[PDB]
Ligand binder design. Structure first.
Ligand SMILES: Cc1cc2nc3c(=O)[nH]c(=O)nc-3n(C[C@H](O)[C@H](O)[C@H](O)COP(=O)(O)OP(=O)(O)OC[C@H]3O[C@@H](n4cnc5c(N)ncnc54)[C@H](O)[C@@H]3O)c2cc1C
Ligand SMILES: Cc1cc2nc3c(=O)[nH]c(=O)nc-3n(C[C@H](O)[C@H](O)[C@H](O)COP(=O)(O)OP(=O)(O)OC[C@H]3O[C@@H](n4cnc5c(N)ncnc54)[C@H](O)[C@@H]3O)c2cc1C
Ligand SMILES: Cc1cc2nc3c(=O)[nH]c(=O)nc-3n(C[C@H](O)[C@H](O)[C@H](O)COP(=O)(O)OP(=O)(O)OC[C@H]3O[C@@H](n4cnc5c(N)ncnc54)[C@H](O)[C@@H]3O)c2cc1C
Ligand SMILES: Cc1cc2nc3c(=O)[nH]c(=O)nc-3n(C[C@H](O)[C@H](O)[C@H](O)COP(=O)(O)OP(=O)(O)OC[C@H]3O[C@@H](n4cnc5c(N)ncnc54)[C@H](O)[C@@H]3O)c2cc1C
Ligand SMILES: Cc1cc2nc3c(=O)[nH]c(=O)nc-3n(C[C@H](O)[C@H](O)[C@H](O)CO)c2cc1C
Ligand SMILES: Cc1cc2nc3c(=O)[nH]c(=O)nc-3n(C[C@H](O)[C@H](O)[C@H](O)CO)c2cc1C
Ligand SMILES: Cc1cc2nc3c(=O)[nH]c(=O)nc-3n(C[C@H](O)[C@H](O)[C@H](O)CO)c2cc1C
Ligand SMILES: Cc1cc2nc3c(=O)[nH]c(=O)nc-3n(C[C@H](O)[C@H](O)[C@H](O)CO)c2cc1C
Ligand SMILES: O=c1ccn([C@H]2C[C@H](O)[C@@H](COS(=O)(=O)O)O2)c(=O)[nH]1
Ligand SMILES: O=c1ccn([C@H]2C[C@H](O)[C@@H](COS(=O)(=O)O)O2)c(=O)[nH]1
Ligand SMILES: O=c1ccn([C@H]2C[C@H](O)[C@@H](COS(=O)(=O)O)O2)c(=O)[nH]1
Ligand SMILES: O=c1ccn([C@H]2C[C@H](O)[C@@H](COS(=O)(=O)O)O2)c(=O)[nH]1
Lengths: 216, 216, 216, 216
């Protein structure tokens, strides 16, 4: 479990396989016996020559807590499975992403960073109070919730194979992606590296297209 | 172009094929010649016996304007293509879905429907004014936008084949789906029926799983 | 490992999760604690009301040995991952599916079933001898192999989630599917039932569309 | 319609959109008005920076006649739609790919190229005669067909968007792909270039990974 932003997290729930799962699929192997030099070279060969289907046989399930504006970017990754909390069927919790003053580093703002912080807190507080007043007046939850801002936290389970995960890292562990999702992608990368060190290193060396994971 | 909700729309931008596209794919036909009785029966046979791959050769592109809370449900349909306006790269417009008083029919509310309406307007107005104040103070748009509520309108192009479209109609043209997306699904159905009448009628008769399209 | 046909097999290589994986994803649960009555009812509710995305969080990897004509049907299942032996990069083994005389039960043939059996053996033997003569004359393997018949055995790893697996069972564990792939689908079903008994029983009761698994 | 190999073909059956379809989707444009300089630069920007989702809004349907060994490679492309002739439900035609003597250029063979050619013809003739004898004895077609070699011609309709098509060209219009499928990929490229010249040129310049289309 890795903490992200002020109240977010990424947690690994389950994993199928490891580096050897890709090697075994690539060879269609009967062997369930590790030979680092040979297996590692095959992983590098596959990665450097674009043969990534074998990495689809490694699968992760994560539990993620993130603001809706981050989730909407994340859920654009179609080659994966999602299940998310419903604001139709339950009351949504009072939890919002409030950027730290540091979030505005490099931006000259005509009001102080601390005042930006508090103005965001103020509007989310008003919006949640309206949500609650609507709920408490008998407005159905599926309608009441529409006044809640995009920095509201949500949670989801994400099941994804290592190939689609690498695509996600190319796009999201990268400076062009929004900073907030970058932070999530760094945590995803860290877990991927822990479970699949040979694949991760080969990925970085041969296939990774982004500009942050080689710098951290 | 069909108007939906207070400010939304669905518009057909382009289409490839028609009922005969499915028949020709099913037969792997060299013929590019219509025989209603024969072609229509083949469509019904395919539909009633679950052989839906031939309908994937009919493709639509729609332009949709809908609130974000509707779009987030819609974008869960992974077997399709989407491109959506960015709140990272442009200023988002002042346009929100405000439910009509009629939206609360059947719900006894402890405040009048008209007061629910105005309370929703009030909070979206405050949130947008905060968004603008943040933008105008030099806060990057990608951060400023997080205070905007889920009833903010967005727009997207949606490219989808008739098989995935039929899945969308099963799930969204149905009473269990949120009323707001139901309204969009009715418009999608109407366009589908216009362009593919034989497939649509066969769908309704043999494969449609929902409970509204047989009643309208 | 389950033997299929004369020389085929299905073997489970790895699995992620079990019945509880779907329940936990459906609830977006922090709990990693089994409550049969409650969890089983949720599985049945999901299955009977068409909410099958939670079953995507259960994943299998199988190693399959089957004739090419069976593999070509199987590989039409796009929502899954495959890696297969290459006849471009290695010599293919002398192993063919020869139907038993029993395979023709119900068919009056103008030559005896045993003679059908031997005529199939004879032609595959001639084709393989030609393949070998071409290989041994320096014809590249990728070209030599084109003379080999469709009953040649191949092997592949198949990674598939429980939702796509259930689709596969609907279509292939069914009398309309070719008998030879039916036999494979029965083995897949047996493994699925072993690992996911609650999901399998709910599937049979509420969602399974075929006509053999309720009869065996 | 483009002839391929000795008896194969690729034919465009239908297309949705053109270069402007991608531009319009990328901008979520209301405009249905061409501005070459501006639209072409946007296409290049998208292509060079990996933003390829807009090209998914361009869709093709092809009719392809190819040998089974080519089709089995082609059908590995999961992000597309296929419908193919059935050897379960109809008699398969006597049509086989026979390599020309030129196919063996660069390979020293211990029998003459012309003799390789005739040995392939001989075995396919024997296999087809066996197929026919089995059919004519009352063996079901789905069983009789298993003796037919992989160079048997088949036909299919293929519906694919420009993004998946570009992936197909990266992998198949390339020297590592089997020569026979390369020839098909060259024809696909030619049609793609005809219908989408700006996208094709941008693809070649910025995203194409193979080593033949820049040389022809
Ligand atoms: C910096 C940045 C800015 C962005 N800006 C915008 C924006 O302004 N508007 C917007 O709408 N989106 C935007 N996106 C989202 C982007 O367009 C993709 O939806 C997202 O990056 C997921 O990428 P993907 O399609 O590769 O992932 P997945 O959907 O997981 O697809 C994985 C791979 O499968 C293939 N694939 C899956 N489905 C299909 C298909 N139907 N056809 C062809 N290939 C398929 C592709 O090879 C793809 O790479 C942005 C993303 C980034 C990183
Ligand atoms: C009434 C209702 C309530 C809902 N409540 C919730 C909720 O509380 N939480 C929540 O997160 N979502 C919820 N959803 C969304 C739902 O779980 C699906 O994401 C959505 O309905 C799209 O369905 P789909 O997967 O069939 O569509 P698509 O993603 O377009 O898939 C089309 C078909 O392709 C197949 N498919 C595609 N990808 C895969 C894959 N990876 N594995 C296996 N098969 C695949 C399936 O056969 C699927 O039917 C709800 C939907 C409805 C209609
Ligand atoms: C009895 C029988 C006879 C058959 N005869 C023929 C034949 O004569 N010719 C022939 O070519 N094939 C034939 N097939 C194969 C059949 O057309 C399908 O390719 C196969 O059954 C796989 O089904 P699927 O598409 O549901 O599986 P998958 O490809 O695994 O798809 C799973 C689900 O995802 C969705 N999905 C995936 N991709 C797409 C997409 N691109 N668009 C929309 N939805 C998508 C659908 O909801 C689908 O049900 C036959 C199959 C059977 C069982
Ligand atoms: C030279 C060469 C040699 C080959 N040798 C072999 C071999 O020996 N054995 C063998 O079995 N195959 C072999 N193949 C086939 C290869 O492994 C792929 O199946 C094929 O090239 C299609 O590529 P694709 O997966 O990118 O295409 P598609 O299946 O069309 O996928 C398009 C894109 O969508 C994404 N995608 C789709 N589905 C998934 C998923 N489930 N998970 C993650 N991402 C997904 C990926 O981004 C992918 O690039 C070979 C191919 C080539 C070109
Ligand atoms: C997806 C995939 C693609 C492959 N592509 C090639 C290839 O282009 N050339 C090759 O000689 N072997 C290929 N192989 C076989 C094998 O991995 C490789 O030849 C050697 O193992 C490298 O040591 C491939 C295997 C797989 C699973
Ligand atoms: C996807 C698909 C599935 C088919 N399934 C069957 C089948 O189960 N049985 C059959 O006799 N013909 C099948 N056919 C062939 C054909 O459509 C059908 O036999 C007749 O055309 C019905 O008039 C199929 C064709 C396609 C494209
Ligand atoms: C994919 C999915 C779909 C759901 N659909 C519904 C629904 O249509 N109605 C509902 O009341 N709850 C729905 N729920 C919530 C929940 O599973 C259900 O209300 C109760 O748990 C049943 O006991 C859904 C949950 C998921 C994960
Ligand atoms: C899929 C997609 C990705 C985009 N990515 C970026 C980006 O990384 N940076 C950016 O400034 N604009 C991006 N844009 C917006 C726009 O195309 C671009 O800023 C200008 O139009 C370039 O002239 C993107 C648009 C789309 C549809
Ligand atoms: O960095 C980005 C920018 C946009 N998008 C997608 C997500 C959503 O469907 C749409 C608008 O996203 S927004 O730009 O973050 O508002 O485009 C992303 O997925 N990532
Ligand atoms: O009717 C529904 C309910 C939920 N969902 C999906 C959309 C979103 O990813 C998540 C939460 O949606 S919400 O319930 O409308 O808040 O679940 C849907 O797609 N449709
Ligand atoms: O039962 C069937 C019949 C056909 N097919 C697909 C497989 C192949 O791509 C094509 C022809 O298959 S054959 O009918 O077994 O020759 O259609 C299947 O996938 N299953
Ligand atoms: O060039 C290649 C080599 C292999 N394959 C796939 C196709 C088939 O499912 C399997 C074996 O193909 S074969 O090598 O052409 O026999 O791997 C390809 O798709 N392309």
């Amino acid at each position: 479990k890795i903490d992200i932003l002020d109240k977010g997290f990424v947690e690994l729930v389950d994993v199928m396989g490891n580096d050897l799962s890709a090697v075994r699929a690539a060879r269609v192997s009967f062997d369930m016996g590790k030979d680092e030099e040979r297996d590692r070279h095959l992983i590098e060969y596959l990665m450097k020559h674009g043969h990534e289907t074998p990495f689809e046989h490694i699968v992760f399930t994560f539990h993620v807590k993130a603001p809706i504006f981050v989730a909407r970017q994340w859920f654009r990754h179609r080659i994966a499975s999602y299940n998310e909390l419903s604001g139709r069927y339950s009351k949504l919790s009072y939890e919002f992403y409030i950027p730290s003053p540091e979030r505005l580093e490099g931006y000259k703002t005509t009001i102080p960073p601390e005042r930006v912080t508090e103005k965001i807190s103020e509007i989310v507080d008003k919006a949640y109070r309206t949500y609650l007043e609507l709920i408490e007046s008998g407005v159905p939850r599926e309608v009441a919730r529409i006044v809640l801002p995009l920095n509201l936290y949500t949670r989801f389970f994400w099941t994804v194979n290592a190939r689609s995960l690498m695509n996600f890292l190319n796009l999201r562990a990268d400076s062009h992606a929004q900073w907030e999702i970058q932070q999530y992608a760094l945590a995803i990368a860290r877990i991927f590296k822990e479970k699949c060190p040979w694949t991760f290193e080969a990925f970085l060396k041969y296939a990774y297209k982004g500009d942050i994971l080689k710098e951290v």
